[PDB]
Amino acid sequence: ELQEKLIAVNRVSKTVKGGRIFSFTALTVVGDGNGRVGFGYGKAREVPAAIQKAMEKARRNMINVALNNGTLQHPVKGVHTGSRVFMQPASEGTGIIAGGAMRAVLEVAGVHNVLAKAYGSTNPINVVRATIDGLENMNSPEMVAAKRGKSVEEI
Amino acid sequence: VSMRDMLKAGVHFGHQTRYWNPKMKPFIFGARNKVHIINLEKTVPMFNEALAELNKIASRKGKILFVGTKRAASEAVKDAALSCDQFFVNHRWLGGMLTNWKTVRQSIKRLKDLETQSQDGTFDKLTKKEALMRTRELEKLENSLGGIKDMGGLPDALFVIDADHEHIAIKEANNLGIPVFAIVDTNSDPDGVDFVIPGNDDAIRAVTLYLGAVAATVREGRSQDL
Amino acid sequence: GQKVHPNGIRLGIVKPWNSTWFANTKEFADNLDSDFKVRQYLTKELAKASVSRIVIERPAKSIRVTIHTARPGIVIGKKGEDVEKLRKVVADIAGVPAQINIAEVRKPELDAKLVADSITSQLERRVMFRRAMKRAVQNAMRLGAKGIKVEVSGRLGGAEIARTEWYREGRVPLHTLRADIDYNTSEAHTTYGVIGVKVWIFKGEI
RNA sequence: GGGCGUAAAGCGCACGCAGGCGGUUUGUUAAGUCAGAUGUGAAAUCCCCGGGCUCAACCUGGGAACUGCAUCUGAUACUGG
RNA sequence: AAGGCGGCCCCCUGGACGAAGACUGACGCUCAGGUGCGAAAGCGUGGGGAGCAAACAGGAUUAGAUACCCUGGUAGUCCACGCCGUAAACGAUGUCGACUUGGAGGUUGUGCCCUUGAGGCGUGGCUUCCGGAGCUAACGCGUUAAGUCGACCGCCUGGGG
RNA sequence: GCUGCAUGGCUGUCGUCAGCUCGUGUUGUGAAAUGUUGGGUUAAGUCCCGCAACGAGCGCAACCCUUAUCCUUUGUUGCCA
Numbered sequence: 061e062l063q064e065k066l067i068a069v070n071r072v073s074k075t076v077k078g079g080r081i082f083s084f085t086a087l088t089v090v091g092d093g094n095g096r097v098g099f100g101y102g103k104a105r106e107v108p109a110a111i112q113k114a115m116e117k118a119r120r121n122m123i124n125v126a127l128n129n130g131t132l133q134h135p136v137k138g139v140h141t142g143s144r145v146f147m148q149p150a151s152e153g154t155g156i157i158a159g160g161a162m163r164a165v166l167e168v169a170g171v172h173n174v175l176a177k178a179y180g181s182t183n184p185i186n187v188v189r190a191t192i193d194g195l196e197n198m199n200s201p202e203m204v205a206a207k208r209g210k211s212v213e214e215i
Numbered sequence: 216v217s218m219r220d221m222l223k224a225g226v227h228f229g230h231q232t233r234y235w236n237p238k239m240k241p242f243i244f245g246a247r248n249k250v251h252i253i254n255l256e257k258t259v260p261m262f263n264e265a266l267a268e269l270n271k272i273a274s275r276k277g278k279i280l281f282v283g284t285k286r287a288a289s290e291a292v293k294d295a296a297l298s299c300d301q302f303f304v305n306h307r308w309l310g311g312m313l314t315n316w317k318t319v320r321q322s323i324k325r326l327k328d329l330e331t332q333s334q335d336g337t338f339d340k341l342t343k344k345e346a347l348m349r350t351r352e353l354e355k356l357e358n359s360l361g362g363i364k365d366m367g368g369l370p371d372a373l374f375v376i377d378a379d380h381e382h383i384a385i386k387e388a389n390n391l392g393i394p395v396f397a398i399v400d401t402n403s404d405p406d407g408v409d410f411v412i413p414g415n416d417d418a419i420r421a422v423t424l425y426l427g428a429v430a431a432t433v434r435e436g437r438s439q440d441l
Numbered sequence: 442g443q444k445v446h447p448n449g450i451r452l453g454i455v456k457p458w459n460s461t462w463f464a465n466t467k468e469f470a471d472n473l474d475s476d477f478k479v480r481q482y483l484t485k486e487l488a489k490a491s492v493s494r495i496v497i498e499r500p501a502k503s504i505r506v507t508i509h510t511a512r513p514g515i516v517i518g519k520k521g522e523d524v525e526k527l528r529k530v531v532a533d534i535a536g537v538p539a540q541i542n543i544a545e546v547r548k549p550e551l552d553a554k555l556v557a558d559s560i561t562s563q564l565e566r567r568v569m570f571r572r573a574m575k576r577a578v579q580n581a582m583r584l585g586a587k588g589i590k591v592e593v594s595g596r597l598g599g600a601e602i603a604r605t606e607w608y609r610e611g612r613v614p615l616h617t618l619r620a621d622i623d624y625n626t627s628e629a630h631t632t633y634g635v636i637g638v639k640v641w642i643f644k645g646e647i
Numbered sequence: 648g649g650g651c652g653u654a655a656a657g658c659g660c661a662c663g664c665a666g667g668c669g670g671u672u673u674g675u676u677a678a679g680u681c682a683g684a685u686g687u688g689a690a691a692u693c694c695c696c697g698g699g700c701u702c703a704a705c706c707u708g709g710g711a712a713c714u715g716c717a718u719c720u721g722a723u724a725c726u727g728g
Numbered sequence: 729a730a731g732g733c734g735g736c737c738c739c740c741u742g743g744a745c746g747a748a749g750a751c752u753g754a755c756g757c758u759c760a761g762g763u764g765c766g767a768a769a770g771c772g773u774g775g776g777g778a779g780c781a782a783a784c785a786g787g788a789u790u791a792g793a794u795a796c797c798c799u800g801g802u803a804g805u806c807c808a809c810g811c812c813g814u815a816a817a818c819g820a821u822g823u824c825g826a827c828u829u830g831g832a833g834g835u836u837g838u839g840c841c842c843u844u845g846a847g848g849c850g851u852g853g854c855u856u857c858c859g860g861a862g863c864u865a866a867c868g869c870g871u872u873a874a875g876u877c878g879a880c881c882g883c884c885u886g887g888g889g
Numbered sequence: 890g891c892u893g894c895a896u897g898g899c900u901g902u903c904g905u906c907a908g909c910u911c912g913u914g915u916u917g918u919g920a921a922a923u924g925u926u927g928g929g930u931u932a933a934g935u936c937c938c939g940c941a942a943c944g945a946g947c948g949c950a951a952c953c954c955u956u957a958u959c960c961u962u963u964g965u966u967g968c969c970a
């Protein structure tokens with residue numbers, strides 16, 4: 061019922077006394093389509109084995125995101141080691157406007173309308189981390205209402 | 216459980232003022248002759264409620280695992296667990312004992328098979344060679360995983376006798392979302408701990424007092440369920 | 442370094458000799474040559490018959506040849522016409538009458554000759570070696586191999602320099618004597634050279 | 648809407664004029680700041696709602712926009728005097 | 729302040745920090761240009777020259793050895809007065825101010841406690857080491873920040889050229 | 890007849906030296922790390938203790954051969970209390 065898709069696959073190497081030892085890495089994102097999204101990173105000698113490992117890694121380490129209506133509550137800015145991510149909620153019907161890694165993360169999470177831009181490095185492993193960081197730190201008016209002790213007359 | 220009971224048992228001692236954790240300030244009264252004092256007026260009320268929710272977790276037919284590897288309270292934690300029919304670890308907390316439960320269970324079935332086919336089973340085929348080897352494997356697995364042989368699953372909650380000295384267990388519990396009931400000393404770190412119990416753990420009479428409180432609660436849970 | 446032949450080392454223990462006949466020094470080399478003639482002639486014209494093992498027996502007044510193969514239908518023909526022609530020629534090779542007993546192997550992929558000859562044959566049919574070795578390994582594990590190891594070496598992929606390529610799944614306890622390792626070696630004659638293929642199959646101990 | 652320990656990048660160090668910035672309270676001013684109004688900001692163009700070439704490009708009515716400037720009146724929290 | 733400063737004594741002289749008050753009353757921070765200071769080497773004039781030692785000479789080494797090694801050896805290193813204004817002039821980290829968990833030292837003041845004592849409790853200045861949160865590409869920095877922030881100045885914009 | 894510097898097969902060498910790896914877990918943004926390090930011990934990555942590691946595999950060892958002791962079985966072509 062939940063959706064899963066593969067971000068990128070990369071071949072890595074570890075040289076030994078005999079020579080190189082080739083390996084394959086898989087970055088995947090798993091989301092239920094509501095705002096519960098996670099990512100998994102796995103390593104294996106074979107591409108099917110590597111992608112499978114990332115699949116179970118993503119089912120654990122799931123997070124929850126509070127969405128308004130298929131979109132973000134407010135503009136959000138997610139920063140990881142070398143990647144800067146700016147996402148802001150857009151109007152209905154505008155669709156998803158984001159880079160490769162961010163679009164997959166966003167679409168499996170369940171955000172249909174969003175304007176998202178990536179600054180800094182565009183390494184898939186780090187932009188996915190930055191995107192997850194933004195969806196965390198974004199908040200909901202009811203949790204803010206309890207946070208400030210001011211009820212929900214703000215909106 | 217009371218003010219005077221813990222004071223008499225001497226749980227109010229903490230470590231030296233050279234080993235303290237700046238996160239312990241709310242739970243330190245003063246330092247006398249470079250010995251911190253843990254405020255009983257603060258630890259008792261949260262000790263009682265932590266014991267209270269321990270009763271609630273036991274009410275759901277839970278599995279409570281008593282983790283202590285210090286030589287101070289080895290026999291202390293073992294008898295307290297067995298008396299209340301709960302499970303324990305005493306020799307040494309194996310890294311990945313919670314997270315890597317599948318491989319651990321493989322060792323446990325291996326452990327389980329050997330007693331029933333050697334001791335209460337048959338003593339044939341000794342060959343006089345591997346008998347000592349096989350009994351030694353039994354003893355190694357008995358001290359290591361003997362206390363968790365029957366669990367067949369993940370613990371519902373953990374009771375930890377030192378947060379800092381079993382931080383590996385604490386981080387695995389946090390990763391797996393297992394509630395933590397840990398006693399924290401001056402030199403420990405309570406961040407990973409979920410229901411902190413400020414108190415001493417270097418005293419046999421103190422640790423038996425603390426294990427007696429948890430034992431009374433869990434048996435009350437069982438009897439209340441009955 | 443170099444390895445002992447796993448069949449040869451365990452020949453006296455668990456591996457039945459291909460030749461299980463006795464005589465004196467007078468006809469030792471003579472009947473050894475006859476076994477060579479029989480085996481090479483048999484293999485050359487049963488290259489398609491998936492011949493795996495040839496067991497030559499010499500009862501006191503005849504020769505018996507047991508052919509362990511995977512395709513008895515081809516090696517017998519219709520009503521046994523082919524086995525009688527092989528009888529004529531094989532008997533004339535050694536100058537004595539010959540009995541032929543054909544034994545079938547239900548699992549070809551667990552015998553080291555069929556897997557080796559198949560991998561070799563794919564090379565001159567221009568199948569890429571990495572996929573070929575992987576196909577063999579997967580077949581063995583599915584059909585119940587306890588351990589597998591395949592060695593394809595020499596002029597891989599038309600390169601200038603020969604490379605060694607091997608891939609091991611499961612369990613191959615060569616140094617264990619009671620271990621049952623069926624080993625065979627086969628060769629591939631390709632337009633860019635000649636390729637050696639080695640297969641170890643472990644199928645339990647004692 | 649970027650950086651400067653090691654990737655390019657902290658003057659060798661300091662004093663110091665111009666300049667930039669400036670603790671805290673009261674009064675006053677109203678220069679910055681903000682609000683209102685008035686006059687301008689040509690038409691075409693761009694955008695919105697329509698109209699006519701059989702459609703379309705194209706042409707075209709109204710509107711919005713051109714929030715920029717200037718003046719007058721007012722507010723005094725912050726900056727400045 | 730940096731560059732730097734090491735026998736002892738005397739003369740002249742600058743800054744720093746601590747204790748308890750008194751006093752002025754925003755007189756402050758930063759700083760383009762400008763000015764001043766600025767290791768060693770070097771330059772000018774006049775001295776001095778023990779040791780050391782560019783250059784240079786000889787002897788080895790080496791296929792060669794305009795070097796490394798050895799024996800010597802002039803400038804220079806030393807002083808006075810000018811000039812030079814450059815260093816991996818480095819903490820490779822501009823100055824000023826505020827805030828943010830800790831621990832052990834060193835060094836210099838200073839208030840107390842039966843000052844009994846060859847004993848402890850406080851408070852400052854400066855200074856090393858380790859490390860928390862945080863930050864960082866990472867190494868690491870971590871109350872003396874590369875953390876959280878403000879003021880101003882300098883600088884950077886691919887590698888060569 | 891040429892090219893082992895196109896190769897297969899086979900062999901020498903360090904060296905019978907004790908190493909070479911994987912699964913799951915954990916760590917690291919990541920390549921990867923950990924396991925395999927450390928206190929000892931062993932002929933040995935042999936074993937033990939500690940240890941974010943828990944196990945597992947190929948190698949070490951064991952199974953094969955011979956010699957060292959005894960018991961039982963058959964006694965000629967071997968032995969003679």
Ligand SMILES: [Mg+2]
Nearest residue numbers: 442443444445
């Ligand atoms: Mg050999």
Ligand SMILES: [Mg+2]
Nearest residue numbers: 649650884885
């Ligand atoms: Mg830049």
Ligand SMILES: [Mg+2]
Nearest residue numbers: 653654655820
């Ligand atoms: Mg450089």
Ligand SMILES: [Mg+2]
Nearest residue numbers: 653654655656
């Ligand atoms: Mg630089």
Ligand SMILES: [Mg+2]
Nearest residue numbers: 657659821822
């Ligand atoms: Mg500097």
Ligand SMILES: [Mg+2]
Nearest residue numbers: 669670671726
């Ligand atoms: Mg002011």
Ligand SMILES: [Mg+2]
Nearest residue numbers: 677678679680
């Ligand atoms: Mg005004």
Ligand SMILES: [Mg+2]
Nearest residue numbers: 689690691713
């Ligand atoms: Mg106009």
Ligand SMILES: [Mg+2]
Nearest residue numbers: 768769770805
């Ligand atoms: Mg000089």
Ligand SMILES: [Mg+2]
Nearest residue numbers: 770771772804
């Ligand atoms: Mg001079």
Ligand SMILES: [Mg+2]
Nearest residue numbers: 781798799800
């Ligand atoms: Mg010299």
Ligand SMILES: [Mg+2]
Nearest residue numbers: 731767817818
């Ligand atoms: Mg210097």
Ligand SMILES: [Mg+2]
Nearest residue numbers: 659814815817
């Ligand atoms: Mg310079």
Ligand SMILES: [Mg+2]
Nearest residue numbers: 657658818820
């Ligand atoms: Mg510099």
Ligand SMILES: [Mg+2]
Nearest residue numbers: 662758759823
């Ligand atoms: Mg200044």
Ligand SMILES: [Mg+2]
Nearest residue numbers: 858859869870
């Ligand atoms: Mg540090």
